[PDB]
């Protein structure tokens, strides 16, 4: 006959799919018509207390830099005068510690790039050895191995387009 | 002999590698030297500057605040004040724009669910049916080709390599 089979080839479950998926979906409209109902309800309060911020921010604000402003402003004169006094002779001394240290740590550098060398030359030199045997056994096996997990995914993309097809 | 050859398989361009490069590197000593100078010069009047400006920007801050935070702030209860009494009916009648926008948009998307099925099957469809051919002679001439490329960047590791090992 040309119906069980072509109803099981056509692949139902696109059908039910579709339907639960839009079905439990559905509740999205519910979700959105509560969400409206408390943006409401709580826009009544939600906007005596916006105003009532600028209010209580707009007399606070001022009234927090008088005090706050001259204390924090005079006080960073004062911390930073001094600071810099210090700071002053610090600077050269400080300057020269760390000039000294980036120097120095790089004045190795000119003998450990010549040792260093030597060490990763050899290094490599022995690992490349034993990689080259190891390597063509390595690519070897790969060749089936990788073939195995794509011969996998081919055969579901195949596969289910081949049953999506039905013909 | 063994000195021709030995320097040859050597390397001796490693000497003027790190050589050539010192070489020029070295000017980095005068570059700091130069902007240490600099950096002496400049503070001295980098000071006052500093000092001058926290003067400037301290009464400039209160006394721009109370002409500016003043109209700013009056400006913005007056400002807020109309576009929230207007905002209040727009606002539900935006909403019953926008709430019909996003819905009705996905009206459409039920049916277009269905519809673009059969055109993203068929489509599929077809495009695979030539792709299974196409695909055989694709990779078959991956294997060569994408060999051709390994090779080449196998040869200069090997190569760079057994030159630098010498033996």
């Not at 600028?54 to 402003?69: A, I, N, S």
């Not at 060490?119 to 089936?144: C, I, N």
């Amino acid at each position: 006959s040309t119906f069980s089979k072509l109803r099981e080839q056509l692949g139902p479950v696109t059908q039910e799919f579709w339907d639960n998926l839009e079905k439990e979906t559905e509740g999205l409209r519910q979700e959105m018509s509560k969400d409206l109902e408390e943006v409401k309800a709580k826009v009544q309060p939600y906007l005596d207390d916006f105003q009532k911020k600028w209010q209580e921010e707009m007399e606070l604000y001022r009234q927090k830099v008088e005090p706050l402003g001259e204390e924090m402003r005079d006080r960073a004169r004062a911390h930073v005068d001094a600071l810099r006094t210090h700071l002053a002779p610090y600077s050269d001394e400080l300057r020269q510690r760390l000039a000294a240290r980036l120097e120095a740590l790089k004045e190795n550098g000119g003998a450990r790039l010549a040792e260093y060398h030597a060490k990763a030359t050899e290094h490599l030199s022995t690992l490349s050895e034993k990689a080259k045997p190891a390597l063509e056994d390595l690519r070897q096996g790969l060749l089936p191995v990788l073939e195995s997990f794509k011969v996998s995914f081919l055969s579901a993309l195949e596969e289910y387009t081949k049953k999506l097809n039905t013909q």
